[PDB]
Amino acid sequence: MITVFGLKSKLAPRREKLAEVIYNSLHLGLDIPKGKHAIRFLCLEKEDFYYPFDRSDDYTVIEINLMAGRMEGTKKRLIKMLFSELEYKLGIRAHDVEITIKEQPAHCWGFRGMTGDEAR
Amino acid sequence: MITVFGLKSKLAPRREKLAEVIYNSLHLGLDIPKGKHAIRFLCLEKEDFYYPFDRSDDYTVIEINLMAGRMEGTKKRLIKMLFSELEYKLGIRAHDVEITIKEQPAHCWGFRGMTGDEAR
Amino acid sequence: MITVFGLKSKLAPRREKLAEVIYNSLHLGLDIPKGKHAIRFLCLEKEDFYYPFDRSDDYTVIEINLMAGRMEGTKKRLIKMLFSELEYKLGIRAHDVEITIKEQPAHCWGFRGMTGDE
Numbered sequence: 528m529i530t531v532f533g534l535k536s537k538l539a540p541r542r543e544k545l546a547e548v549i550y551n552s553l554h555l556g557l558d559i560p561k562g563k564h565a566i567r568f569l570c571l572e573k574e575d576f577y578y579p580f581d582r583s584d585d586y587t588v589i590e591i592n593l594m595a596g597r598m599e600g601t602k603k604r605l606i607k608m609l610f611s612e613l614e615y616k617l618g619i620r621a622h623d624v625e626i627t628i629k630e631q632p633a634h635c636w637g638f639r640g641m642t643g644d645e646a647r
Numbered sequence: 648m649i650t651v652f653g654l655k656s657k658l659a660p661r662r663e664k665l666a667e668v669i670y671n672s673l674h675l676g677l678d679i680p681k682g683k684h685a686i687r688f689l690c691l692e693k694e695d696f697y698y699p700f701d702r703s704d705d706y707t708v709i710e711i712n713l714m715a716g717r718m719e720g721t722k723k724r725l726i727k728m729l730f731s732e733l734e735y736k737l738g739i740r741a742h743d744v745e746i747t748i749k750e751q752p753a754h755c756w757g758f759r760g761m762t763g764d765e766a767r
Numbered sequence: 768m769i770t771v772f773g774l775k776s777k778l779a780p781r782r783e784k785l786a787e788v789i790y791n792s793l794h795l796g797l798d799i800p801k802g803k804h805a806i807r808f809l810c811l812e813k814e815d816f817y818y819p820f821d822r823s824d825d826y827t828v829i830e831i832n833l834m835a836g837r838m839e840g841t842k843k844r845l846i847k848m849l850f851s852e853l854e855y856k857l858g859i860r861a862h863d864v865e866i867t868i869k870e871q872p873a874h875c876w877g878f879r880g881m882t883g884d885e
């Protein structure tokens with residue numbers, strides 16, 4: 528599952544589009560078909576979000592979990608794509624975007640009654 | 648800490664039983680005593696949960712964090728048991744569950760004042 | 768992003784002192800200037816927080832995400848400094864504190880339009 532964190536005031540009305548944008552970059556960048564992944568939104572109240580001092584209220588954190596296996600370039604590509612999509616499609620400046628890809632071996636994944644190393 | 652993510656209407660009512668099942672499979676499958684582990688539940692509002700298109704409102708994500716060291720087979724067993732247990736006790740179709748085990752080096756953990764590598 | 772999880776009744780009044788302490792340990796332990804990292808708080812309802820049964824409702828979990836690279840002893844320092852700070856400055860006993868440092872390769876990070884390895 529992918530999670531997007533942000534101040535509720537700014538993130539709340541941006542949900543549908545951020546989902547479309549991520550589903551787009553996952554497809555276009557990793558060939559994962561749209562809707563294949565779960566996407567969650569966490570809308571923060573002001574007092575819970577201490578974003579970095581030099582950033583703005585649009586500060587958006589994206590956590591992406593993948594089964595380990597891809598090349599660094601492919602991972603870098605999705606990060607660059609995500610920045611572009613956010614800038615040109617939501618007005619969120621790369622400045623205010625933070626992203627992290629977390630990977631775990633296939634055998635640490637479980638979906639559809641199977642472990643990931645056994646999915647075929 | 649282990650986190651369970653699910654849609655509020657479906658997850659809230661099952662909170663108590665899921666903790667038992669998780670404590671049960673942690674105990675039963677890894678030897679961790681009913682309650683040595685923190686378990687958190689995050690109840691999502693519908694607008695915040697884009698589970699995979701073709702799944703149901705019963706979609707439940709489980710994130711499990713452990714100190715590294717167990718063998719691959721041990722971790723698969725845990726995932727496998729969690730699938731069975733949630734099927735039989737909660738009636739959650741395995742197709743509706745996603746699980747990921749995240750592991751971190753012992754020295755990256757902290758509990759009861761020590762670093763994980765120092766413990767006992 | 769670093770996240771701090773705790774019972775809302777105990778965590779909410781602690782947020783500011785808690786951010787200061789994390790910024791302080793990150794600066795002294797890792798040389799990271801205050802305010803460079805985002806800190807998030809997740810205030811829990813009693814119903815959602817099954818902390819271990821022999822623990823107390825002060826139970827606090829801290830997840831720290833770092834770009835891989837630092838030395839093992841540095842990571843350990845940071846953890847030990849955080850136990851100090853929280854107990855002696857917030858009164859939260861080290862037994863009621865769980866911490867985990869999660870590291871990802873620089874190429875897995877993205878900020879200010881760049882990837883961490885760039």
Ligand SMILES: N[C@@H](CCC(=O)O)C(=O)O
Binds near residue numbers: 528563564593594638
């Ligand atoms: N969303 C899962 C795959 C789920 C499925 O195969 O049904 C992943 O991160 O790989």
Ligand SMILES: [Cl-]
Binds near residue numbers: 569689809
């Ligand atoms: Cl969360």
